[PDB]
Structure formats: C-alpha cells, structure tokens
Design an enzyme around this catalytic site. Structure first.
Site, PDB file in Angstrom:
ATOM      1  N   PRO A   1     -24.049 -18.613 -19.659  1.00 39.25           N
ATOM      2  CA  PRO A   1     -24.961 -17.550 -20.401  1.00 39.25           C
ATOM      3  C   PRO A   1     -25.686 -16.661 -18.940  1.00 39.25           C
ATOM      4  CG  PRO A   1     -25.374 -20.092 -20.593  1.00 39.25           C
ATOM      5  CD  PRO A   1     -24.301 -19.762 -19.606  1.00 39.25           C
ATOM      6  N   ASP A   2     -26.338 -15.570 -19.417  1.00 37.16           N
ATOM      7  CA  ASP A   2     -27.174 -14.866 -18.322  1.00 37.16           C
ATOM      8  C   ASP A   2     -28.280 -15.690 -18.017  1.00 37.16           C
ATOM      9  OD1 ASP A   2     -29.048 -14.525 -20.335  1.00 37.16           O
ATOM     10  OD2 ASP A   2     -28.437 -11.844 -20.454  1.00 37.16           O
ATOM     11  N   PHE A   3     -29.311 -14.734 -17.096  1.00 33.86           N
ATOM     12  CA  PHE A   3     -30.237 -15.933 -16.994  1.00 33.86           C
ATOM     13  C   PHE A   3     -31.971 -15.395 -17.329  1.00 33.86           C
ATOM     14  CE2 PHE A   3     -28.348 -15.487 -12.295  1.00 33.86           C
ATOM     15  CZ  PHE A   3     -28.398 -17.278 -12.511  1.00 33.86           C
ATOM     16  N   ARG A   4     -32.090 -14.325 -17.957  1.00 32.97           N
ATOM     17  CA  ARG A   4     -32.720 -13.392 -18.346  1.00 32.97           C
ATOM     18  C   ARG A   4     -32.929 -12.820 -19.970  1.00 32.97           C
ATOM     19  NH1 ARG A   4     -32.953 -12.102 -13.375  1.00 32.97           N
ATOM     20  NH2 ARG A   4     -34.828 -12.762 -11.891  1.00 32.97           N
TER      21      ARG A   4
ATOM     22  N   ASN B   1     -23.239 -12.435  -9.424  1.00 34.15           N
ATOM     23  CA  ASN B   1     -23.372 -13.780  -9.748  1.00 34.15           C
ATOM     24  C   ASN B   1     -22.824 -14.733  -9.255  1.00 34.15           C
ATOM     25  OD1 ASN B   1     -21.181 -12.104 -12.785  1.00 34.15           O
ATOM     26  ND2 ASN B   1     -24.045 -12.722 -12.360  1.00 34.15           N
TER      27      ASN B   1
ATOM     28  N   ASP C   1     -20.810 -17.463 -10.614  1.00 39.00           N
ATOM     29  CA  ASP C   1     -19.372 -17.917 -11.257  1.00 39.00           C
ATOM     30  C   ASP C   1     -18.207 -17.889 -10.263  1.00 39.00           C
ATOM     31  OD1 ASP C   1     -19.125 -15.717 -11.696  1.00 39.00           O
ATOM     32  OD2 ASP C   1     -19.486 -15.863 -14.041  1.00 39.00           O
TER      33      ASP C   1
ATOM     34  N   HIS D   1     -24.849 -13.409  -3.793  1.00 41.79           N
ATOM     35  CA  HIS D   1     -25.565 -14.165  -4.076  1.00 41.79           C
ATOM     36  C   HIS D   1     -25.001 -16.149  -3.195  1.00 41.79           C
ATOM     37  CE1 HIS D   1     -28.567 -12.188  -6.304  1.00 41.79           C
ATOM     38  NE2 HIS D   1     -28.828 -12.072  -5.488  1.00 41.79           N
TER      39      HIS D   1
END
Ligand SMILES: Nc1ncnc2c1ncn2[C@@H]1O[C@H](COP(=O)(O)OP(=O)(O)OC[C@H]2O[C@H](O)[C@H](O)[C@@H]2O)[C@@H](O)[C@H]1O
Ligand SMILES: O=C(O)COCCOCCOCCOCCOCCO
Ligand code: NA
Ligand SMILES: [Zn+2]
Length: 272
Positions: free
Chosen positions: A35-38, A109, A111, A128
């Site tokens: 999934p993404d964040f938003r 990301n 991941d 990040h």
C-alpha cells in the site's frame, strides 16, 4: 498547447535527454503489492487511524517510538527484503540506467525495491533512509541491517549488544536530518535534462519543492493517478501529465520508446 507523452519518449529515444532525474513515491510500489500512505481506503495512514497511535504519522516519530516501538517494528518486518518484488515501474528505471540515461533516482520509499531492482547504489538516493543499516538509539553505534534481521523477523525488538538500547533502522523519522546522499540533489537537479515524477502525492517536503529545482527549460513528466503539487499549481511550459495507473502510464511510455520487447525480456529475466 502542451508537450505530449510521445514528445518525451522521442527526446529519450534520440538521446536528446541523457541526464534523466527520477523522483518516486509510494505509488510506484502499489503494483508490487505494497500500500501507499495517502490513498483513501487502502493507504497506510487511513488504516493506522484504527490503532493505538495518537495519529498515523506517529509511526515515524521518535517520542512515540520510545514509548512503543512495536508498531514501527511490525512495519520493518514486513518491508525488510523478502516479501515483495519490484514491478515494471522499477524495471523501467533499471532499463533507463542500463542504457546510460539515468543521472539519479531519488526515492521517498523505504521498501528498498529500487536497490532490489538493480539500481546501483551510486545512482540511487534513498532520501527517507533504508533498512540496510541501523543505529543504536542510546550509544549511536552503527549496525548493518543484516545484524538485526533475525530479531526483526522474530517479532523481537532488537537491542544493542553493548548498551541494551533499542537499535533503530536508519529510516528517517520526523525531525531527523535527511541522509548524506541527499546532498547530491545540489548538483543533480541543475544538471537534469529531464525530470520524471512517478507515484507521489508531492505533499511532503523536500520532494514537493525539488520538482521546482530543475531549470525552467527542462520537461517534467508526471506519471500518477492525479495531478499534484507544483505540477498542478505551478505548471511550466514543458510539463506533461500522464494521469492514471502507473503501470499503464509506464507501459505507454515504453511502447512510445520502442522498448516494449526489451522491457518484457528484462522483467521475465529478473522476475519470471
Ligand atoms: N497504481 C497507482 N497508479 C498511479 N498512481 C498511484 C497508484 N497508487 C498510488 N498512486 C498515487 O501515488 C501517490 C502516493 O502518495 P502518498 O501515498 O502520499 O506517498 P508519497 O510517497 O508521495 O508520500 C511521501 C511521504 O509521506 C509519508 O509520510 C512518508 O514519509 C512518505 O515517504 C498518490 O498521489 C496516489 O494517488
Ligand atoms: O513503498 C513504501 O516504501 C512506502 O510504503 C510503505 C508502506 O508500509 C506498509 C507496511 O506496513 C505493514 C505492517 O503494518 C504496520 C502495523 O502498524 C501498527 C498498527 O498497530
Ligand atoms: Na520502491
Ligand atoms: Zn547501544
């Protein structure tokens, strides 16, 4: 009057653009199953609202982390290399690299799928942070990520061998400095002859403003569900938006490039 996706394709095909900077976010890994964040409904931040965090963003905040590191480590266990493969989005970036046209790939990301896809470390800025390394929160001793992997996989909060402090993966939390390699943006962004922006909402700095840091003559291609950020509010003459599914958009670029067969071969050799 606007550039087309084909126009950008043809700049690349001709090697007119040879210094491509790429910016990505969590939308590029939804086709890998993450999934993404938003995104409403499926994003991580909609789904942490139901848990015992004061708000979703606390999973990347240090005061919360010290109070309860378990949520963050649940996420670390899921994202440590092993459960997801890069998708055609990632492998398009690898193909661009292998053709000598990638100046740098900037990612938000965590991941690790760009590294997994074979982007060399010198060509990548994991802005990040990464699960590849970790730091004791007490004594500041650095560790390879591989050192804590067994604990992470075992649902155990890793403790430092010397001081017993919690050993935290080198994921950037709120308020922490960005990684050293982020320094490269100073050189890369003025040098870019093409900016590609994939699968990011551009809600978060520094990536929102970095879209503005390329020369005003440089085309900016957004491949995303929605028109976002400066691309929506501060459009420039040579911007292009390919709106919709990121795999569909990348595959349309690839077709325009005449790279479909090569992409199919690469993806099958890497992931078949
Ligand atoms: N299959 C898809 N096809 C096209 N667009 C997609 C797809 N899936 C999602 N999108 C779009 O992909 C975008 C995903 O946006 P966000 O979820 O905000 O992720 P970020 O990487 O920008 O988050 C930045 C930082 O914020 C956090 O606090 C962390 O620190 C993050 O690193 C949306 O515009 C989606 O519509
Ligand atoms: O592509 C990325 O790098 C960005 O998206 C990362 C999304 O992370 C989802 C993985 O988290 C799964 C484990 O759930 C966390 C549990 O939190 C505690 C809730 O109580
Ligand atoms: Na990724
Ligand atoms: Zn320690």
């Amino acid at each position: 009057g606007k550039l087309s996706l084909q126009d950008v394709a043809e700049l690349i095909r001709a090697r007119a653009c040879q210094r491509v900077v790429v910016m990505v976010g969590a939308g590029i890994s939804t086709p890998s199953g993450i999934p993404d964040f938003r995104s409403p409904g499926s994003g991580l931040y909609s789904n942490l609202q139901q848990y015992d965090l004061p708000y979703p963003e606390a999973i990347f905040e240090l005061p919360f982390f010290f109070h309860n590191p378990k949520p963050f480590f649940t996420l670390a266990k899921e994202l440590y290399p092993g459960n997801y493969k890069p998708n055609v989005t990632h492998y398009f970036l690898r193909l661009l690299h292998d053709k000598g046209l990638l100046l740098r790939l900037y990612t938000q990301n965590i991941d690790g799928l760009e590294r997994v896809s074979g982007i060399p470390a010198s060509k990548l800025v994991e802005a990040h942070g990464t699960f590849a390394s970790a730091t004791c929160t007490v004594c500041q001793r650095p560790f390879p990520g591989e050192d804590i992997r067994a604990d992470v996989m075992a649902d155990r909060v890793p403790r430092c061998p010397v001081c017993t402090g919690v050993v935290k993966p080198d994921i950037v939390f709120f308020g922490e400095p960005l990684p050293q390699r982020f320094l490269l943006h100073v050189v890369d962004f003025p040098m870019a002859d093409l900016l590609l922006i994939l699968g990011t909402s551009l809600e978060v700095e520094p990536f929102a403003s970095l879209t503005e840091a390329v020369r005003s003559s440089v085309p900016r291609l957004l491949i995303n569900r929605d028109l976002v950020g400066p691309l929506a509010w501060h459009p420039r003459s040579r911007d292009v938006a390919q709106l919709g599914d990121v795999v569909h958009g990348v595959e349309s670029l690839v077709e325009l490039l005449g790279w479909t067969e090569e992409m199919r071969d690469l993806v099958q050799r890497e992931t078949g």
